[PDB]
Amino acid sequence: AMGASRLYTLVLVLQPQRVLLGMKKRGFGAGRWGGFGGKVQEGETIEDGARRELQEESGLTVDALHKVGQIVFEFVGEPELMDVHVFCTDSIQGTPVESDEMRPCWFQLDQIPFKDMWPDDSYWFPLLLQKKKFHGYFKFQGQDTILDYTLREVDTV
C-alpha cells in the first residue's frame, strides 16, 4: 500500500510584480524561504486551514484562496507522506508581520530566491507564475537531495 499521508497547506501571495515568501525560523527547513502553511486541523476544510495558516504565520487575513496545486512529499526514513495543497491569492489588505515561526518578505518576480527555497520549488513555482495548475510528487533524502519526482500540469487540481 501507498504510505499514509498527512494534510498540509501552502499559500503564496502572488501580485503582478512580486511574491510574498516566508523564511522558516526554526526546526526542519529552517533558513529556507517558501509559502506559508501547516497541518490542516480536525473539522477544518483545506481552504480554511490555508487561510488560518496564512494569518497565523504572516498576520494576513484573506477571505478566500485559489487552489492551484497538490504536491506529495516523501522522505527517506519516514513512512508518512506529506499531502500539501497549494493555494494562491493576489488580494491582501493588511501588512505581513513576523511571527514566531516565519519571517515574511517580498521578492520581485525577477528576483525569485530559488537558491534559498526548497529544491522542489524550482519545478512547480514556474507553473504557478504561468497561471497553470499542477500535481507533483517528490522523494527526498534529507533536505537537499531529490531521489525521484513526478510533475504534471493539470486542468483541475
Q: Where are the domains of the chain?
A: 1-157
What 3-state DSSP class applies to 121?
A: helix
What beta strand segments (E) does the chain contain?
A: 5-14, 18-24, 33-34, 66-75, 78-89, 102-108, 133-141, 145-154
How many residues make up the chain in this entry? 157
What 3-state DSSP class applies to 129?
A: helix
Residue in this structure with the C-alpha cell 525577477, named with its chain if needed: 110
Please indicate the experimental technique that yielded this structure: X-ray
- Name residues whose C-beta falls within 8 Å of residue 91's C-beta, 6 or more positions apart in sequence: 62
Furthest C-alpha separation in the chain: 45
Residue in this structure with the C-alpha cell 527517506, named with its chain if needed: 76
- The sign one gets for the Cα dihedral 7, 9, 10, 16 is positive
CATH superfamily of 1-157: Nucleoside Triphosphate Pyrophosphohydrolase (3.90.79.10)
Burial class (CB in 10 A: 0-12, 13-18, 19+), 105: middle
Q: What's the CA gap between 67 and 81, in Å, rounded?
A: 20
